[PDB]
Amino acid sequence: MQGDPEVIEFLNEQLTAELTAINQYFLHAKLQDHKGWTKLAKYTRAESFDEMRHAEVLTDRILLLDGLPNYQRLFHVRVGQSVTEMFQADREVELEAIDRLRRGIEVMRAKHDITSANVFEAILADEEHHIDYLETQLDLIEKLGESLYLSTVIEQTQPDPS
Amino acid sequence: MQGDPEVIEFLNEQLTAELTAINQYFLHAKLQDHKGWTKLAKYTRAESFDEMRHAEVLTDRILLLDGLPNYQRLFHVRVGQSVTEMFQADREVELEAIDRLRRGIEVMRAKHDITSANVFEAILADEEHHIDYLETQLDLIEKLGESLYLSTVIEQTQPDPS
Amino acid sequence: MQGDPEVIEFLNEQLTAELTAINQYFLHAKLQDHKGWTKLAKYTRAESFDEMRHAEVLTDRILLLDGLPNYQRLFHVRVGQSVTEMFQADREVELEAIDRLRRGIEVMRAKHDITSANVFEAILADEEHHIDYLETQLDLIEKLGESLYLSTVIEQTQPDP
Amino acid sequence: MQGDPEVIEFLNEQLTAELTAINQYFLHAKLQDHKGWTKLAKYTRAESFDEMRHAEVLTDRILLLDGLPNYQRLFHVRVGQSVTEMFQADREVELEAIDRLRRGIEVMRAKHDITSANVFEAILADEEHHIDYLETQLDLIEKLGESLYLSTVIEQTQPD
Amino acid sequence: MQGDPEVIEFLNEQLTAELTAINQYFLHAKLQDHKGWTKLAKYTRAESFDEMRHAEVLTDRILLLDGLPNYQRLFHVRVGQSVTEMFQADREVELEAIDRLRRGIEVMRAKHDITSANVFEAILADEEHHIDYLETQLDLIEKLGESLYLSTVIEQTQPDPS
Amino acid sequence: MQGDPEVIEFLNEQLTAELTAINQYFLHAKLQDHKGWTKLAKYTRAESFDEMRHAEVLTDRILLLDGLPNYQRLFHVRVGQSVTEMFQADREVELEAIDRLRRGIEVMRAKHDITSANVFEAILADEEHHIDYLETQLDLIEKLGESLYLSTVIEQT
Ligand SMILES: [Fe+2]
Ligand SMILES: [Fe+2]
Ligand SMILES: [Fe+2]
Ligand SMILES: [Fe+2]
Ligand SMILES: [Fe+2]
Ligand SMILES: [Fe+2]
Ligand SMILES: [Fe+2]
Ligand SMILES: [Fe+2]
Ligand SMILES: [Fe+2]
């Protein structure tokens, strides 16, 4: 039971993209946390955890196919100062991810392999949901005003009592 | 046993510093309470209690060595009318405390003492966290605007543990 | 709606006296705790906390009338070695407190003000109770002696039961 | 409040080495779980999570000093097929980490810094404990024999 | 990993001192209980258990660093009759421990190892606390009087139900 | 009340032997725990605690007789690197202990003391039980083998 080499390379590329997503999301979460912004930090921390779960399932599937996952390669990492650059870079990486997912799902369904294809469209759906969230928040910050919007994520108003 | 005068005088100076910090922070919390701003008052109250604990432990340490803790003399306590200048004053007294503590801990580690060096380390860490929070707060208020930021604290607390 | 000066410096001076009292009481409690006299330390700590509540409410009232609280100045703080001198110092402090509080309460009661007078009889009642306790303690120490009283108060902090 | 270049660069190097260690531990854990050595898999997962928390505290400290942490560059990672070589790779990365750590702690204590010195002290202690575990396990495996140890570590109690 | 025998011999000295201290305190606790003196016996029991824990940490550290823990060497064990000389002997034992631990901590921190330095710091703090207790109780028994002091600890009852 | 010198000497020798056993058991327990043989370490700590309680009751009895216990002096302590040598060391120290116990029992019984006889009987029974356990482990290891015996006791939790 050996998979095709193109299947292995597609899984490896997706795994590399997931690792880059993990690193970028964690570094961002730390940046917003240091800036003091709380809700953004916790939401992106949850997003990073979800990406780690995706990496888990992908590496299990590729390991079952009798392959050697490569944990050495990593794509480029982008950092900015304001929230707009955060959202723009995240949108870019998710867009390239969706393109790769669509190509991979098409070819995988073409070349008689399904379970890998199934986890492919699962990751596809999750990432398209994340893109929708990112796009709607980008629109909201564009319309609302940067300072006025950021007045929302930060609040010290005794949240402990409940 | 009995301690050499250097450690005793450094501990007494530190005691004076934390007494000044306690008085300054309590007055800041009370004045913040009068102007209706709520959360800042409770945060500063917690800081005041932390400084009270620091003074208590330092007094215990100095009294262990058969010294004479001084409570007669204080430093110059200063007051502000708006948020910016009291934040600045807290930062100033904090920087002075950090520099003096670093010098004393170095010279007193050089003269055979660790336990009091350890308590100085603890005070250093707590004061460093306090100054980092102060600096982040100052940057946020300068970026966002005094009025808009002040709008975020006045009400809508709702402490209901039950 | 702000009050006249005479009331405000009366309150500010009373606050300074309270701050000196809390510092002296805390120092005495810490010393007696180190020496091994535990129950005395507990009582002195309770007294110090009550005096701190006094200071807090009194400065709240000072701020109420659009005042300018000052924390810079302090009265004299005295220290002792045996229980006798500590108790005597506390007695002198309390005597000055009651005298000055009475003069202040009457002088501003004669000037169409009530709430500050009210907090003043509250403080005065507390100080009268405290001076009563210190007086009876000193009298009992005189009646019995020194070593026996310490034997009564001293306890072994075993912390193993 | 800004820190010196030497301390921040030491922090960055340690963070990078630790991230590589996290990745390596996770990889070995997954391969151990694949072949049925479940107990080793649990142990490796616990160690990887501990390294994750250590990296989190390290990046918090470096970001405290108006630093710029890097998650881009990594060091080389190695993999193994049997227990002996993977254990040896673990031990050697631990040794290099502790050596760099001792040099850094001495330099920083000379350069008037305390909090970072304390956190490197804690990390040094934990890596000392972990290297002790690795060495004792390697010696036990050597004495006992590979087949018997593998028979010991097997679970085979999968519910379905 | 291997150790330079300086730290090994310092740890062995501390180990032997701890063992002899354990024996001394255990004997003194038994004797005070025989005299009917209860609370002193309980406190000595607790501090003897503390010293045993210290010895356990010491031997754990010496075994970790690839040492050979020697338990054959024992220092001098001395006894008394009244409370005064028992307290005095405890005081001098603590003083010797403080001095030896001081020399060891300085010389070994001058040798690029700090973990055993940290455990030495903890032990030093504990011993300073214990010697402070010894000094204060000796001073109070001197001032108060011996028989009147012993009247405070004696109690006439059956074996206390724990 | 006043005891006889010979029974006091026997009690002191017993106390010294118990202290030596405490030392050897604790050191052996730590050595075995450092190598991952968990269950043996746990049992050895249990035996050490038993020896401590035995030493404490012996101290109580010897102190009852208006005598002075001995703590400065202790017997020789022996350590090994494999399981067999420590097992034999425990066996031989227990053998010499049981011999001295029997002799002291006879002499002090002839010297009219009674409660000491009972406490020596209790310690005798416990030491005999420990000897039984040691011999059973020894011949089990001998017949079965070093490797498999070490394998069946490691935990790695
Ligand atoms: Fe994660
Ligand atoms: Fe994904
Ligand atoms: Fe402070
Ligand atoms: Fe308070
Ligand atoms: Fe008062
Ligand atoms: Fe690491
Ligand atoms: Fe014990
Ligand atoms: Fe100790
Ligand atoms: Fe025994």
Q: What is the CATH number of the domain that holds A29?
A: 1.20.1260.10
Amino acid at C52: M
Distance CA E37, CA E28 (A): 11
F34:D145 CB<8 A: no
**D84 at B interface, C-beta within 8 A:** no
Distance CA E145, CA F23 (A): 41
In the numeric block, which tokens belong to residue F132? 């039984």
Distance CA C90, CA C23 (A): 12
Cβ neighbour number for residue F22 with a 10 Å cutoff:
20
Query: Cα–Cα distances in Å, from F118 out to C76, F2, F107, F108, F113?
Result: 72, 19, 14, 11, 10
Ligand nearest to the CA of B93: 3
Method: cryo-EM
Q: Taking each helix axis as running N to C, give the angle between helix D146-153 and helix D115-144, from 0 to 180 degrees, rounded to the nearest 10.
A: 110
Return all residues near D160 (Cβ < 8 A) that are at least 6 apart: none
Q: Least CB-CB distance to E144: which of C34, C147, C156?
A: C147
> Is chain E touching chain B, with at least 3 CB–CB pairs below 8 Å?
yes
Chain B residue with minimum CA distance to D63:
B132
Distance CA C50, CA C126 (A): 9
Contacts of A147 in chain B (CB under 8 A): 143-145, 148
Residues D52, D139 contacting (CB under 8 angstroms): no
Q: Which residues surround ligand 6, an ion (CB under 5 A)?
A: D 18, 21
Residues D100, D124 contacting (CB under 8 angstroms): no
Domain encompassing residue B10: 1-162
B135:D1 CB<8 A: yes
Residues C64, C11 contacting (CB under 8 angstroms): no
Chosen from D106, D120, D132, D134 to mutate, greatest number of chain E CBs within 10 A: D132
Length of chain C: 161
| Local structure of residue E8 (DSSP, 8 states) | H
Return all residues near A157 (Cβ < 8 A) that are at least 6 apart: B38, B39, B152, B153, B156, B157
Chosen from E128, E131, E136 to mutate, greatest number of chain B CBs within 10 A: E128
Cβ neighbour number for residue F56 with a 10 Å cutoff:
13
Return all residues near E53 (Cβ < 8 A) that are at least 6 apart: none
Ligand nearest to the CA of C54: 5
Torsion over CA: D69, D75, D79, D85 (sign): negative
Distance CA C18, CA C53 (A): 10
Taking the CA of residue E157 and the nearest CA in chain D, the distance in Å comes to: 50
E112:D125 CB<8 A: no
Output the DSSP codes for E32-101. Answer: HHHTTBHHHHHHHHHHHHHHHHHHHHHHHHHHHTT--------------SSHHHHHHHHHHHHHHHHHHH
Query: Cα–Cα distances in Å, from F114 out to F9, F13, F61, F106, F109?
Result: 16, 19, 12, 11, 7
**D143 at F interface, C-beta within 8 A:** yes
Amino acid at B54: H
Contacts of B49 in chain C (CB under 8 A): none
In the numeric block, which tokens belong to residue F57? 């009751």
Residues E136, E56 contacting (CB under 8 angstroms): no
Known binding residues of F for Fe cation: 18, 51, 54, 94, 127, 130
Return all residues near F41 (Cβ < 8 A) that are at least 6 apart: F29, F30, F32, F33
CA D131 to chain centre: 9
**F31 at E interface, C-beta within 8 A:** yes
Q: Least CB-CB distance to F72: which of E59, E63, E74?
A: E74
Burial of C143 per CB tally in 10 Å (0-12, 13-18, 19+): exposed
Distance CA A157, CA B9 (A): 41
**E53 at F interface, C-beta within 8 A:** no
Nearest to residue F31, comparing CAs of A13, E62, C80, E48?
E62
Compute the distance from residue B51 Cα to the ligand 3 centre, in Å: 6
Q: Taking each helix axis as running N to C, give the angle between helix D83-110 and helix D115-144, from 0 to 180 degrees, rounded to the nearest 10.
A: 160
Chain E residue with minimum CA distance to C158:
E43
In the numeric block, which tokens belong to residue A37? 């912004």
Cβ neighbour number for residue C114 with a 10 Å cutoff:
8
Residues D47, D21 contacting (CB under 8 angstroms): no
CA dihedral C141, B72, B122, E110 (to 10 degrees): -100
Residues A67, D30 contacting (CB under 8 angstroms): no
Contacts of C34 in chain B (CB under 8 A): 63
Burial of D41 per CB tally in 10 Å (0-12, 13-18, 19+): buried
Query: For chain A, what is the largest distance between any 2 Cα atoms, rounded to a whole number of angstroms?
Result: 59
Task: Please name the residue that has the structure tokens 């003269």.
Answer: B111
Which H/E stretch holds residue F137? helix F115-144
> Is chain D touching chain C, with at least 3 CB–CB pairs below 8 Å?
no
Residues B68, B84 contacting (CB under 8 angstroms): no
Q: Least CB-CB distance to D59: which of A30, A59, A63?
A: A30
In the numeric block, which tokens belong to residue B129? 């966290």
Neighbours of chain B (3+ CB pairs under 8 A): A, C, D, E
Query: Cα–Cα distances in Å, from F84 out to B19, F30, F142?
Result: 66, 16, 9
Give the phi and the psi of residue E141 in degrees, each rounded to 5. Answer: -70, -35
Contacts of C31 in chain B (CB under 8 A): 63
Compute the distance from residue C54 Cα to the ligand 5 centre, in Å: 7
Return all residues near F131 (Cβ < 8 A) that are at least 6 apart: F91, F94, F95, F98
Residues F59, F119 contacting (CB under 8 angstroms): no
Nearest to residue D11, comparing CAs of D96, D91, D69?
D69
Nearest to residue E107, comparing CAs of E2, E3, E1, E6?
E6
B72:C69 CB<8 A: no
Nearest to residue E105, comparing CAs of D88, C77, B117?
B117
Neighbours of chain E (3+ CB pairs under 8 A): B, C, D, F
Nearest to residue C116, comparing CAs of C128, C133, C104, C100?
C104
Distance CA D38, CA D55 (A): 26
Reduce the DSSP state of residue F70 to 3 states and report it.
Answer: coil
Cβ neighbour number for residue E94 with a 10 Å cutoff:
19
Reduce the DSSP state of residue F112 to 3 states and report it.
Answer: coil
**C154 at E interface, C-beta within 8 A:** yes
CA A86 to chain centre: 13
Distance CA F14, CA F54 (A): 10
Output the DSSP codes for D95-141. Answer: HHHHHHHHHHHHHHHHTT--HHHHHHHHHHHHHHHHHHHHHHHHHHH
D140:F36 CB<8 A: yes
Compute the distance from residue F49 Cα to the ligand 9 centre, in Å: 10
Taking the CA of residue B49 and the nearest CA in chain E, the distance in Å comes to: 26
> Is chain B touching chain F, with at least 3 CB–CB pairs below 8 Å?
no
Q: What share of chain C is helix, strand, coil (3-state, %, to 5)?
A: 75, 0, 25
Output the DSSP codes for C61-120. Answer: HHHHTT-----S--------SSHHHHHHHHHHHHHHHHHHHHHHHHHHHTTT--HHHHHH
Rg (CA), chain B: 18
Distance CA F1, CA B141 (A): 85
Torsion over CA: F50, F56, F61, F67 (sign): positive
Amino acid at A123: I
Exposure string over B79-115, b if 16+ CB within 10 A, otherwise e: beeebeebbebbbebbeebbeebeebbeebbeeebbe
Rg (CA), chain C: 18
Angle (CA) F3-F8-F11 rounded to 5° is 135
Exposure string over D96-133, b if 16+ CB within 10 A, otherwise e: ebbeebeebbeebbeeebbbbbbbbbebbeebbebbbe
Query: Cα–Cα distances in Å, from A45 out to A38, A85, F135?
Result: 11, 18, 60
Contacts of A155 in chain B (CB under 8 A): 152
Q: Least CB-CB distance to C69: which of B27, B60, B72?
A: B27
Rg (CA), chain A: 18
Distance CA B129, CA B119 (A): 16
Distance CA E134, CA E138 (A): 6
In the numeric block, which tokens belong to residue A46? 């949850």
Q: Which residues pair with E154 in a beta bridge?
A: E37
Q: Is B1 annotated as a binding residue?
A: no
Query: Cα–Cα distances in Å, from C52 out to B19, B50, B57, C24, C93?
Result: 14, 16, 19, 12, 16
Query: Cα–Cα distances in Å, from A23 out to A19, A30, B155, D63?
Result: 6, 11, 38, 15
Cβ neighbour number for residue F107 with a 10 Å cutoff:
14
Known binding residues of F for heme b: 52
Residues A25, A51 contacting (CB under 8 angstroms): yes
| Local structure of residue F37 (DSSP, 8 states) | -
> Is chain E touching chain A, with at least 3 CB–CB pairs below 8 Å?
no
Residues A61, A14 contacting (CB under 8 angstroms): no
Q: Least CB-CB distance to E121: which of B64, B112, B114?
A: B114
Burial of C56 per CB tally in 10 Å (0-12, 13-18, 19+): middle
Distance CA D96, CA C35 (A): 52
Distance CA C89, CA C68 (A): 30
Taking the CA of residue D53 and the nearest CA in chain F, the distance in Å comes to: 21
Residues F21, F54 contacting (CB under 8 angstroms): no
Distance CA D160, CA E21 (A): 58
Domain count, chain C: 1
Task: Please name the residue that has the structure tokens 């409690």.
Answer: C29
What are the helix (H) ranges across chain D?
5-35, 38-64, 83-110, 115-144, 146-153
The resolution, in angstroms to one decimal, equals: 4.2
Residues C41, C25 contacting (CB under 8 angstroms): no
**D152 at F interface, C-beta within 8 A:** yes
Taking the CA of residue A66 and the nearest CA in chain D, the distance in Å comes to: 10
Neighbours of chain D (3+ CB pairs under 8 A): A, B, E, F
Q: Which residues pair with E37 in a beta bridge?
A: E154
Query: For chain B, what is the largest distance between any 2 Cα atoms, rounded to a whole number of angstroms?
Result: 57
Distance CA F125, CA F132 (A): 11
Residues A48, D52 contacting (CB under 8 angstroms): no
Contacts of E43 in chain C (CB under 8 A): 156, 158-160
Distance CA D97, CA D13 (A): 10
Distance CA E144, CA E147 (A): 9
A24:D71 CB<8 A: yes
In the numeric block, which tokens belong to residue C118? 């009210």
How many C-alpha atoms does F111 have within 13 Å on its Cβ side?
16
Torsion over CA: B65, B70, B76, B78 (sign): positive
Task: Please name the residue that has the structure tokens 């028979």.
Answer: D151
Query: Cα–Cα distances in Å, from D39 out to A119, D142, F152?
Result: 28, 18, 15
Task: Please name the residue that has the structure tokens 């030896």.
Answer: E100
Chain C residue with minimum CA distance to E150:
C151
**E115 at D interface, C-beta within 8 A:** yes
Residues E17, E96 contacting (CB under 8 angstroms): yes
Distance CA D6, CA F40 (A): 49
